[PDB]
Design an enzyme around this catalytic site. Structure first.
Site, PDB file in Angstrom:
ATOM      1  N   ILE A  50      -4.889  -1.694  -5.406  1.00 12.94           N
ATOM      2  CA  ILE A  50      -5.620  -2.678  -4.565  1.00 12.94           C
ATOM      3  C   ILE A  50      -5.914  -2.205  -3.125  1.00 12.94           C
ATOM      4  O   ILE A  50      -6.573  -2.924  -2.376  1.00 12.94           O
ATOM      5  CB  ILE A  50      -4.917  -4.074  -4.566  1.00 12.94           C
ATOM      6  CG1 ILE A  50      -3.427  -3.979  -4.187  1.00 12.94           C
ATOM      7  CG2 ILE A  50      -5.066  -4.703  -5.939  1.00 12.94           C
ATOM      8  CD1 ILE A  50      -2.731  -5.281  -3.868  1.00 12.94           C
ATOM      9  N   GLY A  51      -5.463  -0.998  -2.757  1.00  9.38           N
ATOM     10  CA  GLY A  51      -5.726  -0.402  -1.447  1.00  9.38           C
ATOM     11  C   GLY A  51      -5.328   1.061  -1.415  1.00  9.38           C
ATOM     12  O   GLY A  51      -4.422   1.467  -2.144  1.00  9.38           O
ATOM     13  N   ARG A  52      -6.000   1.834  -0.571  1.00 10.99           N
ATOM     14  CA  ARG A  52      -5.705   3.258  -0.380  1.00 10.99           C
ATOM     15  C   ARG A  52      -5.466   3.491   1.102  1.00 10.99           C
ATOM     16  O   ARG A  52      -6.325   3.166   1.920  1.00 10.99           O
ATOM     17  CB  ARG A  52      -6.865   4.147  -0.863  1.00 10.99           C
ATOM     18  CG  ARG A  52      -7.213   4.019  -2.348  1.00 10.99           C
ATOM     19  CD  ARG A  52      -7.299   5.353  -3.081  1.00 10.99           C
ATOM     20  NE  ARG A  52      -7.580   5.150  -4.513  1.00 10.99           N
ATOM     21  CZ  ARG A  52      -7.323   6.013  -5.509  1.00 10.99           C
ATOM     22  NH1 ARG A  52      -6.760   7.205  -5.288  1.00 10.99           N
ATOM     23  NH2 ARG A  52      -7.639   5.676  -6.767  1.00 10.99           N
ATOM     24  N   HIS A  84      -3.499   6.667   3.862  1.00  7.99           N
ATOM     25  CA  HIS A  84      -3.150   8.097   3.942  1.00  7.99           C
ATOM     26  C   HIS A  84      -1.697   8.325   3.475  1.00  7.99           C
ATOM     27  O   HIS A  84      -1.451   9.220   2.678  1.00  7.99           O
ATOM     28  CB  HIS A  84      -3.388   8.657   5.350  1.00  7.99           C
ATOM     29  CG  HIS A  84      -3.306  10.148   5.420  1.00  7.99           C
ATOM     30  ND1 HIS A  84      -4.035  10.967   4.583  1.00  7.99           N
ATOM     31  CD2 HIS A  84      -2.565  10.970   6.203  1.00  7.99           C
ATOM     32  CE1 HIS A  84      -3.758  12.230   4.857  1.00  7.99           C
ATOM     33  NE2 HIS A  84      -2.868  12.259   5.834  1.00  7.99           N
ATOM     34  N   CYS A 124      -0.662   4.267  -1.364  1.00  6.61           N
ATOM     35  CA  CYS A 124      -1.526   3.223  -1.921  1.00  6.61           C
ATOM     36  C   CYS A 124      -0.781   1.902  -2.050  1.00  6.61           C
ATOM     37  O   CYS A 124       0.452   1.874  -2.142  1.00  6.61           O
ATOM     38  CB  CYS A 124      -2.074   3.658  -3.270  1.00  6.61           C
ATOM     39  SG  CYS A 124      -2.941   5.246  -3.191  1.00  6.61           S
ATOM     40  N   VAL A 125      -1.554   0.818  -2.036  1.00  5.17           N
ATOM     41  CA  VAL A 125      -1.071  -0.554  -2.256  1.00  5.17           C
ATOM     42  C   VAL A 125      -1.403  -0.969  -3.701  1.00  5.17           C
ATOM     43  O   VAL A 125      -2.523  -0.784  -4.163  1.00  5.17           O
ATOM     44  CB  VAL A 125      -1.721  -1.563  -1.281  1.00  5.17           C
ATOM     45  CG1 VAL A 125      -1.008  -2.916  -1.329  1.00  5.17           C
ATOM     46  CG2 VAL A 125      -1.688  -1.041   0.154  1.00  5.17           C
ATOM     47  N   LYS A 160       3.355  -1.492  -1.391  1.00  7.25           N
ATOM     48  CA  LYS A 160       2.889  -0.235  -0.809  1.00  7.25           C
ATOM     49  C   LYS A 160       3.930   0.853  -1.054  1.00  7.25           C
ATOM     50  O   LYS A 160       5.092   0.699  -0.665  1.00  7.25           O
ATOM     51  CB  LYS A 160       2.639  -0.398   0.688  1.00  7.25           C
ATOM     52  CG  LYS A 160       2.137   0.867   1.377  1.00  7.25           C
ATOM     53  CD  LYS A 160       1.206   0.610   2.553  1.00  7.25           C
ATOM     54  CE  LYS A 160       1.095   1.837   3.448  1.00  7.25           C
ATOM     55  NZ  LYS A 160       0.614   3.060   2.743  1.00  7.25           N
ATOM     56  N   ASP A 218      -3.338  -0.625  17.048  1.00 10.23           N
ATOM     57  CA  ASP A 218      -4.254  -0.356  15.907  1.00 10.23           C
ATOM     58  C   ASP A 218      -4.922  -1.638  15.378  1.00 10.23           C
ATOM     59  O   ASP A 218      -5.126  -1.828  14.174  1.00 10.23           O
ATOM     60  CB  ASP A 218      -3.528   0.419  14.780  1.00 10.23           C
ATOM     61  CG  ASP A 218      -4.487   1.155  13.822  1.00 10.23           C
ATOM     62  OD1 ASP A 218      -5.715   1.189  14.058  1.00 10.23           O
ATOM     63  OD2 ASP A 218      -3.991   1.705  12.804  1.00 10.23           O
ATOM     64  N   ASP A 275      -0.922  -4.304   9.130  1.00  8.88           N
ATOM     65  CA  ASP A 275      -0.980  -2.894   9.566  1.00  8.88           C
ATOM     66  C   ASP A 275      -0.050  -2.628  10.762  1.00  8.88           C
ATOM     67  O   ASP A 275      -0.462  -2.139  11.813  1.00  8.88           O
ATOM     68  CB  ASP A 275      -2.424  -2.476   9.865  1.00  8.88           C
ATOM     69  CG  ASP A 275      -2.568  -1.014  10.220  1.00  8.88           C
ATOM     70  OD1 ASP A 275      -2.135  -0.171   9.425  1.00  8.88           O
ATOM     71  OD2 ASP A 275      -3.112  -0.721  11.304  1.00  8.88           O
TER      72      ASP A 275
HETATM   73  C1  LIG Z   1     -12.110  -7.062  -4.635  1.00  5.67           C
HETATM   74  N1  LIG Z   1     -10.707  -7.123  -4.201  1.00  5.67           N
HETATM   75  C2  LIG Z   1      -9.790  -6.994  -5.357  1.00  5.67           C
HETATM   76  C3  LIG Z   1      -8.329  -6.932  -4.882  1.00  5.67           C
HETATM   77  C4  LIG Z   1      -8.023  -8.181  -4.034  1.00  5.67           C
HETATM   78  C5  LIG Z   1      -6.575  -8.136  -3.534  1.00  5.67           C
HETATM   79  O1  LIG Z   1      -6.383  -7.045  -2.629  1.00  5.67           O
HETATM   80  C6  LIG Z   1      -5.320  -6.926  -1.787  1.00  5.67           C
HETATM   81  C7  LIG Z   1      -5.264  -5.798  -0.965  1.00  5.67           C
HETATM   82  N2  LIG Z   1      -4.242  -5.641  -0.134  1.00  5.67           N
HETATM   83  C8  LIG Z   1      -3.221  -6.506  -0.081  1.00  5.67           C
HETATM   84  C9  LIG Z   1      -2.157  -6.321   0.936  1.00  5.67           C
HETATM   85  C10 LIG Z   1      -1.336  -7.398   1.332  1.00  5.67           C
HETATM   86  C11 LIG Z   1      -0.404  -7.225   2.350  1.00  5.67           C
HETATM   87  C12 LIG Z   1      -0.299  -6.003   3.011  1.00  5.67           C
HETATM   88  C13 LIG Z   1      -1.120  -4.938   2.652  1.00  5.67           C
HETATM   89  C14 LIG Z   1      -1.050  -3.604   3.365  1.00  5.67           C
HETATM   90  N3  LIG Z   1      -2.222  -3.615   4.271  1.00  5.67           N
HETATM   91  N4  LIG Z   1      -3.373  -3.319   3.740  1.00  5.67           N
HETATM   92  C15 LIG Z   1      -4.539  -3.300   4.357  1.00  5.67           C
HETATM   93  C16 LIG Z   1      -5.771  -2.953   3.574  1.00  5.67           C
HETATM   94  C17 LIG Z   1      -5.801  -3.114   2.163  1.00  5.67           C
HETATM   95  C18 LIG Z   1      -6.937  -2.804   1.421  1.00  5.67           C
HETATM   96  C19 LIG Z   1      -8.079  -2.332   2.048  1.00  5.67           C
HETATM   97  C20 LIG Z   1      -8.078  -2.170   3.443  1.00  5.67           C
HETATM   98  C21 LIG Z   1      -9.232  -1.690   4.125  1.00  5.67           C
HETATM   99  N5  LIG Z   1     -10.169  -1.301   4.633  1.00  5.67           N
HETATM  100  C22 LIG Z   1      -6.939  -2.488   4.199  1.00  5.67           C
HETATM  101  C23 LIG Z   1      -4.533  -3.639   5.750  1.00  5.67           C
HETATM  102  C24 LIG Z   1      -3.342  -3.958   6.368  1.00  5.67           C
HETATM  103  C25 LIG Z   1      -2.146  -3.953   5.592  1.00  5.67           C
HETATM  104  O2  LIG Z   1      -1.099  -4.234   6.135  1.00  5.67           O
HETATM  105  C26 LIG Z   1      -2.056  -5.110   1.641  1.00  5.67           C
HETATM  106  N6  LIG Z   1      -3.268  -7.611  -0.818  1.00  5.67           N
HETATM  107  C27 LIG Z   1      -4.252  -7.834  -1.680  1.00  5.67           C
HETATM  108  C28 LIG Z   1      -9.011  -8.275  -2.851  1.00  5.67           C
HETATM  109  C29 LIG Z   1     -10.443  -8.334  -3.395  1.00  5.67           C
END
Ligand SMILES: CN1CCC(COc2cnc(-c3cccc(Cn4nc(-c5cccc(C#N)c5)ccc4=O)c3)nc2)CC1
Length: 285
Positions: free
Chosen positions: A33-35, A37, A40-41, A59, A153, A171
């Site tokens: 659900i996230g990338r 450096h 990944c999340v 993460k 940041d 973040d």
């Molecule tokens: C289409 N799409 C399908 C998946 C859905 C759910 O996605 C989620 C993604 N991330 C989390 C999450 C929760 C708490 C903490 C973090 C860590 N963290 N991450 C980011 C982050 C995550 C993804 C992209 C970008 C960028 N640019 C930034 C920023 C600050 C931070 O602290 C992540 N939860 C859910 C959303 C809709």
């Protein structure tokens, strides 16, 4: 593999309230659900002390190798746990595995980062909705600043948005990472000195407001990263967005004052932005 046993008893005992058992967490490594450096999340499933399934974000932190990095990881875990505020991301906990890498267990943010939310054409936030998002960010930063915490940041991609469209400043701590640069969100003095204060976070907040009022346009797209400090020293600043009201653009400009003492506090920004918020009409979120 990292040896949990021979770390530091006094430190390890101070962390125990943050620790999550590996049996009590499922991480869905197939669903990214996230990338970042540093890692990944993933979608995770947490089990709280009464045994109820909680949908979470997990993460990984590859690179957390030596005892220094592992100790610093626990200390950041401690710091994060002590923050409680509706517009600040909370830590559920940390999970140190036997074999694998350390894992940061975070609350699932249904609507993802704030920048991708506002950029998406499917979503239709009003001018009031966007001011509201900025106001929420200011309240989080007011909390953090009152706890003597400097973010360093602050940007729209670094704030998350939950099921109720509540904005969480994210973040930081164990969630610090480059997500998918920060030079274009940095205060002028921080560009020259590499020293960061709450007033440098105010600059960054100003740029975040500009992101909101543009629905996630990249700032200074035609200015190269190396010559940004020179751009700002000539007095050049981000232009007023198409659908940005005048009094809120004045707020942005006050955030970008070259002397940091003269910038508003986050406390002042909450007053001013809520006053501006109280003149608009109509909200989708
Ligand atoms: C289409 N799409 C399908 C998946 C859905 C759910 O996605 C989620 C993604 N991330 C989390 C999450 C929760 C708490 C903490 C973090 C860590 N963290 N991450 C980011 C982050 C995550 C993804 C992209 C970008 C960028 N640019 C930034 C920023 C600050 C931070 O602290 C992540 N939860 C859910 C959303 C809709």
């Amino acid at each position: 593999h990292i040896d949990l046993s021979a770390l530091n008893p006094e430190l390890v005992q101070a962390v125990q309230h943050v620790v999550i058992g590996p049996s009590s967490l499922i991480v869905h490594f197939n669903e990214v659900i996230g990338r970042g450096h540093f890692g990944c999340v993933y979608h995770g499933t947490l089990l709280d002390n009464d045994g109820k399934k909680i949908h979470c974000a997990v993460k990984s932190l590859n690179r957390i190798t030596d005892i220094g990095e592992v100790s610093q990881f626990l200390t950041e875990g401690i710091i994060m746990k002590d923050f409680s505020h509706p517009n600040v991301l909370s830590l559920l906990g940390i999970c140190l595995r036997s074999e694998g890498s350390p894992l940061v267990v975070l609350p699932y943010m249904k609507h993802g980062d704030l920048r991708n939310f506002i950029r998406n054409e499917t979503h239709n936030p009003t001018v009031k909705d966007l001011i509201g998002f900025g106001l929420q960010v200011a309240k989080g930063m007011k909390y953090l600043a009152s706890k003597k915490f400097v973010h360093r940041d602050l940007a729209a991609r670094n704030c998350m948005l939950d099921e109720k469209f509540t904005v969480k400043v994210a973040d930081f701590g164990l969630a610090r990472d480059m997500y998918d640069l920060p030079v274009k969100w940095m205060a002028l003095e921080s560009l020259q000195t590499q020293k960061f204060t709450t007033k440098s976070d105010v600059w960054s907040f100003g740029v975040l407001l500009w992101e909101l009022m543009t629905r996630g346009a990249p700032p200074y797209p035609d200015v190269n990263t190396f010559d940004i400090t020179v751009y700002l020293l000539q007095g050049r600043r981000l232009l007023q967005p198409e659908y940005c009201p005048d009094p809120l653009y004045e707020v942005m400009l006050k955030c970008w004052h070259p002397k940091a003492e003269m910038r508003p506090s986050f406390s002042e920004l909450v007053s001013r932005i809520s006053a501006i918020f109280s003149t608009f009409i109509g909200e989708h979120y």
